[PDB]
Amino acid sequence: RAVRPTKRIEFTEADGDTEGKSVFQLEKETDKETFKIRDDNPWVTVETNGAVRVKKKWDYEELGPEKTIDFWVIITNHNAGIKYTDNQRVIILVKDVNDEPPYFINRPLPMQAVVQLNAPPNTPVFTLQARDPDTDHNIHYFIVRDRTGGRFEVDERSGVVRTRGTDLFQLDMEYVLYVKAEDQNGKVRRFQSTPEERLSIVGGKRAPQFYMPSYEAEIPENQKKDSDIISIKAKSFADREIRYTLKAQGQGAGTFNIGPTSGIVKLAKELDFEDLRQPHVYSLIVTATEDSGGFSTSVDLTIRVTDVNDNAPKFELPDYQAHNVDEDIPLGTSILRVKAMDSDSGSNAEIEYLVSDDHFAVDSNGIIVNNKQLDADNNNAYYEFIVTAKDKGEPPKSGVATVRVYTKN
Ligand SMILES: [Ca+2]
Ligand SMILES: [Ca+2]
Ligand SMILES: [Ca+2]
Ligand SMILES: [Ca+2]
Ligand SMILES: [Ca+2]
Ligand SMILES: [Ca+2]
């Protein structure tokens, strides 16, 4: 059994573009020998005949600096005379292909700017910025569709949008441009491209814009007061300072509040998933107002509260007692029924039953049964033991109750 010289081979990304594709064949030294990969590899699998097949679609952008798929292969070989189990290393060099589309990095989205009312021609107003994962990208900027009527133009390389013409812009009017960025070093004979984006240019002045079109957060019911839930941030287009406020529709306001200037949302009142009067989903409205101006804008903020196993199963009675039980009762007789309830939900409310005295047994329905003869070793004619109701929470909480069984002959 020997190490064989390393196999070196070269391919482009695209060659490995189809899951399961047999890209190439490993070299055999006799017909009879078979192949198996030495360890998992994310990019390739190996058939017993030597075929190297794509596992995960090959990706230059996701390989390390070496840009190789590097793996070992076991080669095995009765009736052939000489037996062995060989090792060979296999190194595929992966060449780049322009295969990933460009994407805008402008934030926030949608894209928004303002234009000064009497802006001279060629005033810069916005700067489109795209990025492209491929090594040899070639980003070109375009206005694909104009709804200003021709009052703007973009520089194809810098992505700067600037005014055209001398006419004034109208206060509060929106001027709309649909823009794209494309990578001209890659195609599909059609160039790789961002989705069309809507660039909103408003004359003179506009309301603030939040950094996200909406906000959401899922928090547990047991999370402490005054703790930070989510922080919200808006931008002014005239560099005014901003102050936030919050509302509800129409379930439980006062539960949350917001930081005056810093936008951080905190928990104000302790929560309870078990409290019906509080909802499980909190629909909130956050408005960012310019108190140095007048303008303001709203954004939805949704908070989901989750169940924690804060409740233990409770038995309906504090203790259970059965009387006049004949001791000769055949095994399997219902002696008494027991029941316990749990406030939580799902499996935090799922209930299993146990019994501390192996003379009895109990099923998922709480039926306490006779598990051994009751007439043997029972001088005082009486059993006293504990039932547990145990939930399926993590960790599980328990409820317990005394059970008394008085027997007789
Ligand atoms: Ca790729
Ligand atoms: Ca590529
Ligand atoms: Ca590209
Ligand atoms: Ca609770
Ligand atoms: Ca529980
Ligand atoms: Ca709970």
Swiss-Prot record:
Entry comment describing in which tissues the protein is expressed: In the embryo, the protein first appears in the mesoderm at stage 9 and is present in the myoblasts and muscle fibers by stage 12 and stage 14, respectively. At stage 12 the protein is also located in the axons of the entire CNS, but not in the glial cells. In third instar larvae protein is expressed in the CNS neuropile, photoreceptor axons and precursors of adult muscles.
The protein's name in its UniProt record: Neural-cadherin
Species annotation: Drosophila melanogaster
Domain notes: Three calcium ions are usually bound at the interface of each cadherin domain and rigidify the connections, imparting a strong curvature to the full-length ectodomain.
Function description: Cadherins are calcium-dependent cell adhesion proteins. They preferentially interact with themselves in a homophilic manner in connecting cells; cadherins may thus contribute to the sorting of heterogeneous cell types. May associate with arm neural isoform and participate in the transmission of developmental information.
Location in the cell: Cell membrane
Every Cadherin domain range: 1-104, 115-210, 219-315, 325-409
